[PDB]
Amino acid sequence: CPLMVKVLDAVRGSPAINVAMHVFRKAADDTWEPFASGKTSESGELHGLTTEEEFVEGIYKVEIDTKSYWKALGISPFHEHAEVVFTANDSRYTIAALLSPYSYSTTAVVTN
Amino acid sequence: CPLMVKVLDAVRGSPAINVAMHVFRKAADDTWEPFASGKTSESGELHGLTTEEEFVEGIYKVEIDTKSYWKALGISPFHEHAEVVFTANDSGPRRYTIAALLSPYSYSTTAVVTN
Amino acid sequence: CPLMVKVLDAVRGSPAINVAMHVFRKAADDTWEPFASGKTSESGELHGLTTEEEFVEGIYKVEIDTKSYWKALGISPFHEHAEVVFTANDSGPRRYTIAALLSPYSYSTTAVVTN
Amino acid sequence: CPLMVKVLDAVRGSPAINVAMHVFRKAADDTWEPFASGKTSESGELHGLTTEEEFVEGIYKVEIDTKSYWKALGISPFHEHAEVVFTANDSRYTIAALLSPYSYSTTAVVTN
Numbered sequence: 041c042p043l044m045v046k047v048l049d050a051v052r053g054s055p056a057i058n059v060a061m062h063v064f065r066k067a068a069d070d071t072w073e074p075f076a077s078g079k080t081s082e083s084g085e086l087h088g089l090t091t092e093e094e095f096v097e098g099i100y101k102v103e104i105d106t107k108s109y110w111k112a113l114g115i116s117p118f119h120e121h122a123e124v125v126f127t128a129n130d131s132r133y134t135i136a137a138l139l140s141p142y143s144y145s146t147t148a149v150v151t152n
Numbered sequence: 153c154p155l156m157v158k159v160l161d162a163v164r165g166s167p168a169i170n171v172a173m174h175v176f177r178k179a180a181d182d183t184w185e186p187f188a189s190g191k192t193s194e195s196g197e198l199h200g201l202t203t204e205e206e207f208v209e210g211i212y213k214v215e216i217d218t219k220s221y222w223k224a225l226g227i228s229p230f231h232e233h234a235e236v237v238f239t240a241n242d243s244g245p246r247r248y249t250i251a252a253l254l255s256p257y258s259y260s261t262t263a264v265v266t267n
Numbered sequence: 268c269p270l271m272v273k274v275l276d277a278v279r280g281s282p283a284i285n286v287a288m289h290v291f292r293k294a295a296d297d298t299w300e301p302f303a304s305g306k307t308s309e310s311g312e313l314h315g316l317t318t319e320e321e322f323v324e325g326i327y328k329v330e331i332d333t334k335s336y337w338k339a340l341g342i343s344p345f346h347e348h349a350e351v352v353f354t355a356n357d358s359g360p361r362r363y364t365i366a367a368l369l370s371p372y373s374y375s376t377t378a379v380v381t382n
Numbered sequence: 383c384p385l386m387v388k389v390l391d392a393v394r395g396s397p398a399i400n401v402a403m404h405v406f407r408k409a410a411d412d413t414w415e416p417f418a419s420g421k422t423s424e425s426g427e428l429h430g431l432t433t434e435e436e437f438v439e440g441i442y443k444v445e446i447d448t449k450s451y452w453k454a455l456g457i458s459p460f461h462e463h464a465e466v467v468f469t470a471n472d473s474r475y476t477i478a479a480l481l482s483p484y485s486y487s488t489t490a491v492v493t494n
């Protein structure tokens with residue numbers, strides 16, 4: 041699994057479940073091509089986005105729909121979405137995001 | 153000053169100086185129009201981006217150029233940039249301060265919204 | 268002002284006002300001596316804790332009373348308090364600004380150290 | 383496993399390995415009694431700190447020795463250690479910490 045995303049809720053101290061996200065790859069013309077999407081599981085994780093053969097080097101954007109997550113919990117948030125934009129480099133990627141209504145953090149753990 | 157950005161460097165324990173950022177506003181056709189741009193000062197702040205009159209309701213994207221920042225210091229970071237996307241002014245004018253704390257493989261961003 | 272603390276609330280997008288904090292300095296016998304205390308203002312800042320003369324080298328603990336803060340708002344948080352422990356002034360006097368961003372189950376803290 | 387700790391390094395984008403920590407329980411006289419300790423594994427995790435029978439309600443402190451971690455990497459950090467102080471309440475606890483030299487964040491995920 042080359043690319044995994046994990047989302048945590050800082051208000052409830054829980055996995056952020058049923059959070060939608062879309063992954064985009066940057067195309068030669070600088071537009072964002074849909075690449076992969078899904079919703080986090082009960083453990084706040086989204087696995088199976090892509091495969092090692094498909095996940096070639098390039099710039100990707102993960103757009104996490106944080107606004108709908110907070111709306112379904114009855115809480116007005118600041119951001120429209122969270123965006124994590126990175127280059128995938130051949131020299132496993134776990135993207136993590138901690139959500140608060142007016143703040144979020146994101147970190148990448150890149151391992152073997 | 154209705155929209156200010158402050159950036160901090162978590163490796164050095166200092167303001168993040170000379171960080172470039174581009175602000176965009178979503179147009180009627182769903183594209184991102186350029187709105188304002190600038191770079192942080194020696195206190196890590198960027199003031200004067202826009203005015204109360206020009207900062208009307210809309211969806212704004214602050215794109216902070218973190219990769220350029222870290223590269224200029226010889227560090228190869230993870231992200232291309234930090235993106236802060238939010239609806240502004242949709243219950244009347246507010247003042248926004250967006251903060252970002254930068255590490256090479258992580259960042260955090262928060263907004264303080266006053267009236 | 269050699270030691271300032273700024274606290275932000277990540278649920279409300281605001282300064283964290285009336286947050287109490289106690290600063291301790293490690294004594295020769297390895298115990299924590301009370302050093303200064305105060306509470307944040309309406310801008311979420313606490314200034315005037317100490318003076319250049321009194322803030323000598325040592326190991327300091329800033330204990331931020333986050334549980335009292337959240338409880339006063341009807342939220343049951345996870346932490347008792349946020350603790351920031353650091354050696355100060357050990358290459359000469361510096362100015363420290365400690366920031367903390369508070370959520371009910373998480374917090375972050377950063378220091379900016381100037382000379 | 384009632385109590386797990388996970389530590390991540392924000393400079394290298396990696397698990398923080400071989401990080402020492404000690405866990406204390408608050409005693410009736412307000413002192414901190416040693417309770418459990420260990421070092422994070424290759425995956426940045428420390429499991430097996432305590433058992434469900436021993437982990438009774440009370441106030442605990444996890445002291446993460448972040449200073450020695452940065453020192454062994456040749457980097458001068460700000461904090462002496464990171465401290466996470468919480469009440470364990472019978473109404474599984476995963477404590478996570480993201481380390482930077484001049485900053486850290488910590489979150490709790492409390493699940494069933």
Ligand SMILES: COc1c(O)cc2oc3cc(O)c(CC=C(C)C)c(O)c3c(=O)c2c1CC=C(C)C
Binds near residue numbers: 046388479490
């Ligand atoms: C918000 O703090 C947390 C947190 O509560 C849980 C976290 O869980 C993670 C789990 C992971 O497997 C991995 C990958 C580690 C490998 C060795 C592949 C993680 O990086 C995390 C977390 O980063 C994590 C975090 C910290 C992330 C933030 C504060 C954006």
Ligand SMILES: COc1c(O)cc2oc3cc(O)c(CC=C(C)C)c(O)c3c(=O)c2c1CC=C(C)C
Binds near residue numbers: 252263264
């Ligand atoms: C939560 O992210 C914020 C934030 O929203 C506001 C912040 O305000 C600061 C103001 C400051 O003057 C200084 C000192 C900079 C000097 C040149 C002395 C700050 O460091 C901050 C912030 O740290 C700050 C932050 C980031 C702090 C976190 C993420 C714990």
Ligand SMILES: [Br-]
Binds near residue numbers: 178237
């Ligand atoms: Br949008």
Ligand SMILES: [Br-]
Binds near residue numbers: 174
């Ligand atoms: Br640009």
Ligand SMILES: [Br-]
Binds near residue numbers: 194195
């Ligand atoms: Br300047």
Ligand SMILES: [Br-]
Binds near residue numbers: 066099125232
């Ligand atoms: Br890009």
Ligand SMILES: [Br-]
Binds near residue numbers: 249264
């Ligand atoms: Br602010």
Ligand SMILES: [Br-]
Binds near residue numbers: 289
């Ligand atoms: Br006290």
Ligand SMILES: [Br-]
Binds near residue numbers: 310
């Ligand atoms: Br005041």
Ligand SMILES: [Br-]
Binds near residue numbers: 347408441467
């Ligand atoms: Br306590």
Ligand SMILES: [Br-]
Binds near residue numbers: 293326352462
């Ligand atoms: Br100490």
Ligand SMILES: [Br-]
Binds near residue numbers: 478491
């Ligand atoms: Br977790």
